[PDB]
From a paper:
To investigate binding modes of the unlabeled parent compound [name] to these proteins, X-ray crystallography was performed. A [name]- [name] co-structure was obtained at 1.9 Å resolution. Binding is perpendicular to the nucleotide binding site. The compound bromo-phenyl moiety occupies the same position as the nucleotide adensosine ring. The aryl ring is co-planar with the pyrrolopyrimidine scaffold and the para-substituted bromine engages a deep hydrophobic pocket. The carboxylate moiety on the distal end of the pryrazolopyrimidine scaffold is solvent-exposed and does not interact via any polar or hydrogen bonding interactions with [name]. [name] makes no hydrogen-bonding hinge region interactions. This mode would be unusual for an ATP-competitive kinase inhibitor, which normally bind mainly through this mechanism. [name]-bound [name] domains are locked in the “open” conformation, each interacting in a clamp-like fashion with a single [name] monomer on opposite sides of the complex, giving 2:2:2 [name]:[name]:[name] stoichiometry.
We now report characterization of [name], a novel pyrazolopyrimidine compound that emerged from cell-based screens of telomere signaling. [name] targets the nucleotide binding site of glycolytic enzyme [name] ([name]). We show here that [name] and [name] form a previously unknown complex in cells. We show that both proteins bind TRF2 and telomeric DNA.
Residue numbers in the entry: 5 to 372, 382 to 417
Write the structure that this text describes.
Amino acid sequence: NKLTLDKLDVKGKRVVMRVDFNVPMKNNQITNNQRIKAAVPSIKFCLDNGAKSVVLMSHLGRPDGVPMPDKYSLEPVAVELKSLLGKDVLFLKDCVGPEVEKACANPAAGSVILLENLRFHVEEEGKGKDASGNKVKAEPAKIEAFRASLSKLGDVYVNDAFGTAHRAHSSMVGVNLPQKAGGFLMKKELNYFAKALESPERPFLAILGGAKVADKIQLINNMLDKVNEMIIGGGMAFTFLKVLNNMEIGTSLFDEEGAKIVKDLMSKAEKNGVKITLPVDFVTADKFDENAKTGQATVASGIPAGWMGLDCGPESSKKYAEAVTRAKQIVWNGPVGVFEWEAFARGTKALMDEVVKATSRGCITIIGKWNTEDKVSHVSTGGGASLELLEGKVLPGVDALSNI
Ligand SMILES: Cc1nc2cc(-c3ccc(Br)cc3)nn2c(C)c1CCC(=O)O
């Protein structure tokens, strides 16, 4: 029970809101505006309930504590947000200090202000790199001044930046105001994850894909305490199948360090009564390339020398659909093939099709140009944060919110 924005009285108040506007950019303009979109409901709520101002703060990229306004400025985000809000956004070329404080001290009623990239200061992350690429540490008195300056910019604080909530950064745990509320995005992410983690509908299926095994050990370990079924798919599966079945895997991804714990994970699954589904067939490629020659293989055939599996095949898609069919709650993290490449996308799109059907019949479905909004219960906006939650860790940014 943390304070949320809907329970905060903002009438006549300056709202300082941490958002996640760390959007994809191409040299350098906005390629996907979904994170910006995702914040509008909190922003409008504030303006609709009489807030005097909304001061928005975020990072963009990894400028590493160096001001990089030619490369990583938030300026284009002000223009995009104006389009999406239907309201003027003032952009400020810094995020702390006397001119910014004065600008945010008493804005005209209803003013939306977006500050420049917080990570242009080393005090946000607390560590950074210099102009030469060497590591620098922030000084405590400077971190204190930075956090104090941010704290002046609002009367109340909102954190809607679930994508950054795993970082104990100044804008996340250092704002000292009497009320610190989660935004509606934050609320939605924590509710889908708390529900799922602590009181799952059943059966609860975890679908885990991605490339490396060793970086998902704790994820799998924690999820085996919560779930009833688990598909281990995608690039990870080859390490499992090599160890458990002595499968011939070609040049498929193999994690030497993960391989040591495969059997340990399968034991924990056997100990908690979790039914594990691995793939049984593959689309193969002659090299790691979008237009590689393709082939087909099974666990029993092996993958031929020099070839790699980049997708599951049709029999796997069936077994995966059977598990999705049985589930009343699904959490999916990581794809089941190289879905950016059409030839290796069928498995992922097929599994998505199933998850969308499941949603239609009341399955709670969580995925860690498309209106994906209508089709699944929840698409998470934060990769690393949602992983850290799935691994069973506390998020500093959530823990810092006010209780009530
Ligand atoms: C960057 C990268 N990402 C992925 C992802 C996948 C991948 C993902 C799914 C499946 Br099924 C099979 C392979 N392979 N892969 C490789 C070989 C690379 C490059 C080399 C490596 O990091 O091992």
